[PDB]
Amino acid sequence: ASKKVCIVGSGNWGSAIAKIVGGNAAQLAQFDPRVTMWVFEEDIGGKKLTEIINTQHENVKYLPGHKLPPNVVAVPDVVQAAEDADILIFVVPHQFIGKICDQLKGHLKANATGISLIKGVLKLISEVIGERLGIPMSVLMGANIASEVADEKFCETTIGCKDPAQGQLLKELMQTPNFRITVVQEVDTVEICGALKNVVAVGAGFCDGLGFGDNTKAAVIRLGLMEMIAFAKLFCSGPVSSATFLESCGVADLITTCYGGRNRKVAEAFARTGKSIEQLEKELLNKLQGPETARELYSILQHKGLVDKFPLFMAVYKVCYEGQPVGEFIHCLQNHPEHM
Amino acid sequence: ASKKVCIVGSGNWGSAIAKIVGGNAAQLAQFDPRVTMWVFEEDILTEIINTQHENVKYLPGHKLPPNVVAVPDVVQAAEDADILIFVVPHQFIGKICDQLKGHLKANATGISLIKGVDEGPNGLKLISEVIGERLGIPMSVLMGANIASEVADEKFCETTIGCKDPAQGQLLKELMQTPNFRITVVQEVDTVEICGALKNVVAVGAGFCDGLGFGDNTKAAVIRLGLMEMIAFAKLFCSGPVSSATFLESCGVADLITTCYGGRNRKVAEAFARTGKSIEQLEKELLNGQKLQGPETARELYSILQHKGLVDKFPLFMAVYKVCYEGQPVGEFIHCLQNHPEHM
Numbered sequence: 167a168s169k170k171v172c173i174v175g176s177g178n179w180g181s182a183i184a185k186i187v188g189g190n191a192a193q194l195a196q197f198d199p200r201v202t203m204w205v206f207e208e209d210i211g212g213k214k215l216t217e218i219i220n221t222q223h224e225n226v227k228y229l230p231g232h233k234l235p236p237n238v239v240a241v242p243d244v245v246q247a248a249e250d251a252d253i254l255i256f257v258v259p260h261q262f263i264g265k266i267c268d269q270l271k272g273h274l275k276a277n278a279t280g281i282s283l284i285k286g287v288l289k290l291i292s293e294v295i296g297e298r299l300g301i302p303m304s305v306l307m308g309a310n311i312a313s314e315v316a317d318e319k320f321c322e323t324t325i326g327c328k329d330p331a332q333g334q335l336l337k338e339l340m341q342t343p344n345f346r347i348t349v350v351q352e353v354d355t356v357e358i359c360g361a362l363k364n365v366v367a368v369g370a371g372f373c374d375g376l377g378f379g380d381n382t383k384a385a386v387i388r389l390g391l392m393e394m395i396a397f398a399k400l401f402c403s404g405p406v407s408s409a410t411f412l413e414s415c416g417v418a419d420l421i422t423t424c425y426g427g428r429n430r431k432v433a434e435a436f437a438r439t440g441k442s443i444e445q446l447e448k449e450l451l452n453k454l455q456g457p458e459t460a461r462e463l464y465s466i467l468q469h470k471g472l473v474d475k476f477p478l479f480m481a482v483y484k485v486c487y488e489g490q491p492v493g494e495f496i497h498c499l500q501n502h503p504e505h506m
Numbered sequence: 507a508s509k510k511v512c513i514v515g516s517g518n519w520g521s522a523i524a525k526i527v528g529g530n531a532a533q534l535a536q537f538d539p540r541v542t543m544w545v546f547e548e549d550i551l552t553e554i555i556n557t558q559h560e561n562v563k564y565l566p567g568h569k570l571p572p573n574v575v576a577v578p579d580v581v582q583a584a585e586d587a588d589i590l591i592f593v594v595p596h597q598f599i600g601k602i603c604d605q606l607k608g609h610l611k612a613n614a615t616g617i618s619l620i621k622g623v624d625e626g627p628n629g630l631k632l633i634s635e636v637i638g639e640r641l642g643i644p645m646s647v648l649m650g651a652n653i654a655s656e657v658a659d660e661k662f663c664e665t666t667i668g669c670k671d672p673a674q675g676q677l678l679k680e681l682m683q684t685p686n687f688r689i690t691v692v693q694e695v696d697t698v699e700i701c702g703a704l705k706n707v708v709a710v711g712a713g714f715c716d717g718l719g720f721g722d723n724t725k726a727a728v729i730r731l732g733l734m735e736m737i738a739f740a741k742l743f744c745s746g747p748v749s750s751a752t753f754l755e756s757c758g759v760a761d762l763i764t765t766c767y768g769g770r771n772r773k774v775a776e777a778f779a780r781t782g783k784s785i786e787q788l789e790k791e792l793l794n795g796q797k798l799q800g801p802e803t804a805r806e807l808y809s810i811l812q813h814k815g816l817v818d819k820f821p822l823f824m825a826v827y828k829v830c831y832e833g834q835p836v837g838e839f840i841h842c843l844q845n846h847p848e849h850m
């Protein structure tokens with residue numbers, strides 16, 4: 167009757183979402199209050215993390231100092247966590263979602279649905295999930311970060327969901343006064359924004375490192391946004407409207423990433439220090455996604471014969487991989503298709 | 507024949523624009539190289555410009571090209587011109603248009619680079635309409651994320667041109683575009699132009715978030731909801747076609763970002779939030795009593811929206827107004843965004 171929810175994942179992000187989801191699942195009649203959360207079992211000073219969560223209601227390793235609603239139950243076996251769920255929330259690192267799906271495949275409830283909170287990527291992650299698991303997939307993406315959601319700092323997000331009734335249910339499950347949701351129906355468009363924005367952010371960081379000011383940076387961001395839109399239209403199935411890029415997943419996440427984030431910070435240091443991307447991944451990140459995405463874009467654009475339509479994306483690729491001098495990045499924008 | 511250009515204005519911005527336009531008028535066949543530039547003469551000026559070729563008071567250091575002629579009388583500057591480029595401080599455009607009324611060449615056209623908004627029967631009135639109705643000429647606008655010092659220094663940036671007529675738009679793009687000043691022409695004048703006034707209201711909100719200590723994700727939502735209110739307000743208020751897509755041009759999202767991350771509205775708003783000093787007091791301390799336009803525009807929006815019964819549909823615009831003028835505690839600003847129409 168009432169829908170059952172499983173949170174697949176339990177780090178910083180998954181715990182922060184459990185705080186929100188546990189609360190709405192209890193309050194709203196349409197959800198079962200018993201929310202499972204799959205927690206990779208760990209030994210915390212002689213005690214099982216799942217047992218700590220189910221007694222202290224605190225993920226003492228990944229979200230210390232925060233209480234989770236007591237109706238959120240930690241479950242160490244991912245199949246047992248998920249097998250009776252009507253709604254699955256995927257909130258694990260990109261690195262692990264493939265292995266997790268390979269364990270879940272075939273064990274899910276009929277008519278189960280999913281939403282992916284995994285930002286990044288070409289094959290969209292939500293497609294990998296939905297194909298392996300056979301469930302309809304939504305996405306949740308916007309200008310937000312786990313620690314701020316845990317701290318109830320005001321921010322927004324976009325939910326991409328094709329089915330209107332399922333979108334409304336996901337909004338009801340996730341929305342609070344400090345986590346505001348807009349539902350749109352263009353799943354692919356919402357999700358591709360999270361990957362492409364990091365390419366633009368590398369360019370924005372180049373711009374900072376070359377000594378340019380905010381008006382030049384605003385042009386880099388905006389042209390980047392124009393290339394995101396054009397690329398989404400040629401790559402995405404489903405309708406792709408420029409209007410979706412006004413949502414949090416688009417312009418807002420692009421702004422915050424281009425003004426603060428590791429893609430921008432590594433890019434500024436590359437343009438100022440001379441160090442390679444790889445060296446900078448070592449020094450500051452113990453793989454940077456922006457340059458790798460640019461590489462994949464180069465490959466797609468060659469196939470389509472459209473390299474010259476995307477000079478910002480391609481300058482990020484050339485500078486990161488083919489030795490183009492970073493100092494040429496702005497020159498690459500001086501004959502942009504948007505001004506033809 | 508070749509088109510004659512008059513640059514009506516000669517400030518920091520008008521001189522910067524002279525560099526580009528003088529360069530391009532001299533270079534390009536379709537423009538007469540003789541570009542007039544109207545200069546309000548100054549003891550310490552139009553003679554200094556035509557001799558030394560430098561607006562030593564308003565663009566010191568820079569070389570205006572030589573085919574650009576200062577002219578002290580604005581009618582004499584403008585009367586043979588086919589294209590008038592209005593680039594004076596907003597406070598003078600009224601007086602300039604009054605001197606020019608009835609003295610323009612047949613079929614002359616105009617473009618306004620004056621960012622901001624005027625007053626009129628519908629509350630707000632676009633400067634381009636003030637100009638175009640006073641003079642009876644067709645008007646275009648040029649607006650984007652750009653500032654005079656950087657255009658003169660040839661630092662890369664973009665701008666938007668709003669022009670109803672395609673052939674005229676293309677002419678204006680040729681007059682103004684360089685490798686470091688890139689132009690997109692769109693057909694929506696009012697939409698391009700209204701961004702310049704509304705962005706300063708959002709910037710006051712962005713300044714509140716900085717002075718209350720919120721981070722970049724909160725600020726990005728303030729900026730984005732502010733942009734959503736710009737769009738919805740232009741759709742209900744503006745004449746001429748209004749497209750959401752126009753707000754992704756330089757006049758929209760780019761100028762909004764730069765203004766919310768640097769500019770006097772953001773700076774004064776942050777200081778208001780951090781110190782509890784009034785806008786008026788901060789204007790005195792920081793801007794020689796010059797009036798900050800973001801709050802003033804917010805008051806005008808309030809009146810417009812109150813006459814339409816729509817105050818409740820623009821919570822960000824209205825929170826700026828109530829914080830600046832009705833004593834609403836600035837610390838409540840974010841709360842006013844927690845039941846926004848965009849999320850209903």
Ligand SMILES: [K+]
Nearest residue numbers: 191192194197
């Ligand atoms: K319930």
Ligand SMILES: [K+]
Nearest residue numbers: 531532534537
């Ligand atoms: K010429």
